Design an enzyme around this catalytic site. Sequence first.
Site, PDB file in Angstrom:
ATOM      1  N   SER A   1       1.316  20.462 142.886  1.00 36.17           N
ATOM      2  CA  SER A   1       1.926  18.981 142.861  1.00 36.17           C
ATOM      3  C   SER A   1       3.118  18.774 143.826  1.00 36.17           C
ATOM      4  O   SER A   1       3.401  17.715 144.054  1.00 36.17           O
ATOM      5  CB  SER A   1       2.350  18.727 141.521  1.00 36.17           C
ATOM      6  OG  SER A   1       1.177  18.797 140.668  1.00 36.17           O
TER       7      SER A   1
ATOM      8  N   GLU B   1      -8.771  21.075 141.845  1.00 36.61           N
ATOM      9  CA  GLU B   1      -9.085  21.994 142.662  1.00 36.61           C
ATOM     10  C   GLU B   1      -8.078  22.513 143.478  1.00 36.61           C
ATOM     11  O   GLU B   1      -7.802  23.765 143.842  1.00 36.61           O
ATOM     12  CB  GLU B   1     -10.567  21.981 143.674  1.00 36.61           C
ATOM     13  CG  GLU B   1     -11.699  21.782 142.862  1.00 36.61           C
ATOM     14  CD  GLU B   1     -11.723  20.673 141.844  1.00 36.61           C
ATOM     15  OE1 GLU B   1     -12.314  20.716 140.725  1.00 36.61           O
ATOM     16  OE2 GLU B   1     -11.188  19.571 142.465  1.00 36.61           O
TER      17      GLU B   1
ATOM     18  N   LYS C   1      10.719  17.564 143.003  1.00 39.20           N
ATOM     19  CA  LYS C   1       9.449  17.694 142.831  1.00 39.20           C
ATOM     20  C   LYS C   1       8.854  19.018 142.654  1.00 39.20           C
ATOM     21  O   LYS C   1       8.794  19.942 143.462  1.00 39.20           O
ATOM     22  CB  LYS C   1       8.346  16.931 143.792  1.00 39.20           C
ATOM     23  CG  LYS C   1       6.916  17.137 143.539  1.00 39.20           C
ATOM     24  CD  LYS C   1       6.738  15.977 142.258  1.00 39.20           C
ATOM     25  CE  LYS C   1       5.324  16.095 141.475  1.00 39.20           C
ATOM     26  NZ  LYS C   1       5.369  17.229 140.626  1.00 39.20           N
ATOM     27  N   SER C   2       8.326  19.176 141.412  1.00 41.16           N
ATOM     28  CA  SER C   2       7.877  20.556 140.720  1.00 41.16           C
ATOM     29  C   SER C   2       6.241  20.664 140.888  1.00 41.16           C
ATOM     30  O   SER C   2       5.745  19.612 141.322  1.00 41.16           O
ATOM     31  CB  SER C   2       8.215  20.723 139.593  1.00 41.16           C
ATOM     32  OG  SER C   2       7.885  19.954 138.753  1.00 41.16           O
ATOM     33  N   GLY C   3       5.812  21.692 140.558  1.00 43.08           N
ATOM     34  CA  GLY C   3       4.317  22.011 140.556  1.00 43.08           C
ATOM     35  C   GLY C   3       4.164  23.375 140.035  1.00 43.08           C
ATOM     36  O   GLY C   3       5.059  24.180 140.087  1.00 43.08           O
TER      37      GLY C   3
END
Length: 263
Positions: A45, A143, A209-211
């Site tokens: 992300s 994906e 911003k994390s992911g």
Amino acid sequence: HPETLVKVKDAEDQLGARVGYIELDLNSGKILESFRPEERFPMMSTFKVLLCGAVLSRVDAGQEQLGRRIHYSQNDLVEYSPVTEKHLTDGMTVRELCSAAITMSDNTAANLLLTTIGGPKELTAFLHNMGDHVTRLDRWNPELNEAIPNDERDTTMPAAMATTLRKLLTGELLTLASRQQLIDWMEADKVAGPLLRSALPAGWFIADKSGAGERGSRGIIAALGPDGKPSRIVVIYTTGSQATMDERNRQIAEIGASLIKHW
Ligand SMILES: *C(=O)[C@@H](NC(=O)Cc1ccccc1)[C@@H]1N[C@@H](C(=O)O)C(C)(C)S1
């Protein structure tokens, strides 16, 4: 500060996985500290920030409007779309989609935006154009979060991402108004609580911003600093751990604690 590298290595030990880390001076662009700066990691992300940067560039160029409304249907919904799910009926504006993508990590919002700019190939072309010849987006959600070992798709390098973020936030790439908008979205990030934010001292500034992805993938990009102003960029990625989400969050937060302590 090497004390931070001690923590990064410890994290590698605890997670039994690779951890990529970089501390960059916002102003000068100087690399302050790094660990695996040039190894690839799935962006997950974190790509959303770049996506919204591209969107903003189009807005600046007149090829896009923040107020433009986008319609989508149940058919477009992908896993984890807390905001887009609730607006199927009326649609959402570009501005709202970027907000959702950044602040809530709404996957559908990101997909809609990706389509809007021409797909992963275009985002990639956009990055290349700004001097980032490393970062690449190849797929859509979900994906892009596959994180197949050794797969170069949808990856970046800590040094590349750091450098690109610096350009986005402080370069002549975007207009000031758009830069601020991007920063405002990142400052309003609502799902990154347990990460760097948890170690952030009062009065400090943070835009992040994390992911998260498959195969223990976890990461965060951030611009942070004391006295309500950003002064450094921090990028942390990890992939391959079998550890739980909580375990991964804790390690990232401890890395942050160390970086703050040694500021
Ligand atoms: C981006 O990284 C998104 N991640 C996922 O959808 C991939 C995933 C997550 C868990 C298990 C399997 C696959 C959104 N980003 C993160 C993040 O910002 O922390 C969320 C967990 C909010 S979903």
